[PDB]
Paper text:
[name] (previously mis-annotated as [name] in the reference genome of [name]) is an l-[name], commonly also referred to as a [name] ([name]) and is a crucial enzyme in the biosynthesis of methionine and threonine. Here we report the structures of three homologous [name] enzymes from [name] (MtMetX), Mycolicibacterium abscessus (MaMetX), and Mycolicibacterium hassiacum (MhMetX) and compare them to previously solved structures of HTAs in order to begin development of selective inhibitors of MtMetX via a structure-based approach. Two copies of each monomer exist in the asymmetric unit of all three structures. [name] can be divided into two distinct structural domains, the catalytic domain, and the lid domain. The organization of the catalytic domains’ fold marks [name] as members of the α/β-hydrolase super-family.
The three solved [name] structures include residues 15–70, 77–372 from MhMetX, 10–379 from MaMetX, and 7–372 from MtMetX. The catalytic domain comprises residues 15–181, 297–372 of MhMetX, residues 17–183, 304–379 of MaMetX and residues 17–181, 311–372 of MtMetX. For MtHTA and MhHTA, Ser157, Asp320, and His350 comprise the active site; MaHTA’s triad is comprised of Ser160, Asp327, His357. MtMetX and MsHTA both contain a small helical region (αL1′); MaHTA features a unique pair of short anti-parallel sheets (β1′, β2′). Interestingly, MsHTA is as good if not better an approximation to MtMetX as either MhMetX or MaMetX, suggesting that it may function as a good analog in assays where MtMetX cannot be directly utilized. However, when assaying MtMetX to determine its viability for crystallography, the Tm was found to be between 40–41 °C by differential scanning fluorimetry (DSF) between pH 6.9–8.5 in Tris-HCl. Because of MtMetX’s relative thermal stability under physiological conditions, we have chosen to focus on MtMetX when investigating future drug development. Using the MtMetX structure as a guide, we also elucidate the druggability of the enzyme and propose that it is an excellent candidate for small molecule drug discovery. Of the eleven CS identified by FTMap, eight reside somewhere within the active site tunnel. The closest CS near the catalytic Ser have S = 19, S = 16 and S = 13.
Numbering used by the authors:
A (entry chain B): 8 to 372
B (entry chain A): 7 to 372
The structure:
Amino acid sequence: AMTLPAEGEIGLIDVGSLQLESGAVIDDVCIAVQRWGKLSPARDNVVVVLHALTGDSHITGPAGPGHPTPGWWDGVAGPGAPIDTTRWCAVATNVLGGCRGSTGPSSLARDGKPWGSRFPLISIRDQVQADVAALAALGITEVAAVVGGSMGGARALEWVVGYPDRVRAGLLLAVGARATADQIGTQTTQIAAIKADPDWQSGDYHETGRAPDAGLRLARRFAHLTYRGEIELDTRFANHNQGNEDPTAGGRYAVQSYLEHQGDKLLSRFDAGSYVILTEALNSHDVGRGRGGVSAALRACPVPVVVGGITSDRLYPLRLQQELADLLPGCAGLRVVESVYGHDGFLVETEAVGELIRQTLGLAD
Amino acid sequence: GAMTLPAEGEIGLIDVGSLQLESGAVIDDVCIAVQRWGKLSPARDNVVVVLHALTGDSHITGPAGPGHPTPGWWDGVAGPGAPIDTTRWCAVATNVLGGCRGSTGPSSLARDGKPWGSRFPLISIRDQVQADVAALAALGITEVAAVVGGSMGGARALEWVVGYPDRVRAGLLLAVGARATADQIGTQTTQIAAIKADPDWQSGDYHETGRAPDAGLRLARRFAHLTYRGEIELDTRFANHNQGNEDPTAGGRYAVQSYLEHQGDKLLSRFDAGSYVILTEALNSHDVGRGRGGVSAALRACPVPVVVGGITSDRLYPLRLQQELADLLPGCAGLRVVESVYGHDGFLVETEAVGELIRQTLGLAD
Ligand SMILES: [Cl-]
Ligand SMILES: [Cl-]
Ligand SMILES: [Cl-]
Ligand SMILES: [Mg+2]
Ligand SMILES: [Mg+2]
Ligand SMILES: [Mg+2]
Ligand SMILES: [Mg+2]
Ligand SMILES: [Mg+2]
Ligand SMILES: [Mg+2]
């Protein structure tokens, strides 16, 4: 019954208490939402856009006051765009556990203090439950489609599997049916780097004026390597030095300066507690849990879907998307995005990803 | 040089004296630890140098025990009828300059009686080869039959055959590239940053303080171990399963997580954080083309017969790097592909395939 925010603006949707997969109960949850395009009278034209690990609800448009980053899928929603806002209403949330409007470790609880270590562990399924509740509070009980890559693709997968009667189509991009050992390996070690930072303070650094900046930077540097293509990295930087710096005398290599810059950029806009909470959700991703395993769960989902994967992806290798396309009966076949940019192709390959979105919405109309 | 090799299997300490490094910096009183298997020939022309990788040592074969925290890292490679057949060859292995298993490195004591620590100069792969060559010369060995190595040992072997082509008859270059790649430098410099960000790093002078950067070294090793493994095999072995009866939701661990923590603990008990930094910086500086007109010119001008091998599932030194070496080194008859699910670690695990590469190499040396 709540009203959508004005186009482009952030709305804060109270969804109340949620029972979580761990057994924990979290009260007074708030989900930030942005939308583009008008809602149809039947409220049946919503396209939910699901952001990745460090993304937010700002899917398109420039950076500015209230938006540290530009649209992470800039141009995806608009007149004549892949999500054509003359027909569709693009809606994006800030995920549960995030730090740009939705309830997370850095958010203030009802006592005026950050949740901090009081914030419970959440799953991808918990994130979907919270988004579904936020849409329901807005009078939206069915969506035309859900689209997302990376962690967004995991949210989309659990949405189509968990609510097959309430979504007409999905795009699953650069994701797998469950977390893999390699993903869990790098992800748990990323968390360990943050927790080993002496300023982590058991997750309750928020009020102390100290923060685990060194740990968060290291986590992001290792993560960024998993997001890139091996060949393109060497084509861009090789073993060259940064500018006129001398690595044998305290200077940096070019790829090293680049990685340091990636760490600095994240620190300026993202919370370490959110990084930990959301990476834990990645670790527990498993569409098969409680549903008889991965094959049984996918084979029983009748939702039409487009599945896309990136050739050079080193974090979510193409074999994971081939499995999704082979097992989901609503998938006509894997769509292969050839890209040199690795996992990050799901953000950079604007033309190819735009076409996957258009194909997805074709299955929902 | 007229020192003698230690008794077989036993560690010998070779005084090579002061070395002038590629950078121009000088390091005094360098000691190189050595072990060997097999008798030396009267002409001293049957030496096969086995070059260990980042955290290896001179103990290439044999069990663990007193003085040896780890068993032979290429166990079985040297012996009667083995790939290095000690009825014919003398297998010699050093601990690399900058190491922590007998040779001079950051934890060694300098002339002033204090550990080198932050005073240890940055070294290159070429400096490592210079030291090994000097150690052999002190033993009266001026030419070697062959050099063999994988990973950082392959980088040492490559700089040996390119830098001393008249003093080596053949080389095995396994799971290595002509220069460090951007991806390698990326993970390597971040591993170093993790160690240096540890509060107990103490600018590299933690030695003898009672505190050491254990957390940073564990983290660096965990990330490195992932680069050493095969993606599919890791998931076949561990998948997303919990460790034993633990629950990650309630403080437990995932199976692959407990596995990685154990790799960290194992390295901690036998390896020094300062050595990890110095040797990783030598990997960052790896570039056979430097001062030689670039990679193509350097490789095309090296006439040494070589066997080049690469591992199908290697994610750290991808096969394209060994294709490049095999295409440019005129002494290479063609790339040898090692089929393995175990990633870069296949160069340690695929004993049969690697043993055949060594035999091929030694066939080029007689
Ligand atoms: Cl609770
Ligand atoms: Cl190693
Ligand atoms: Cl070149
Ligand atoms: Mg989960
Ligand atoms: Mg399962
Ligand atoms: Mg199918
Ligand atoms: Mg070097
Ligand atoms: Mg160069
Ligand atoms: Mg050739």
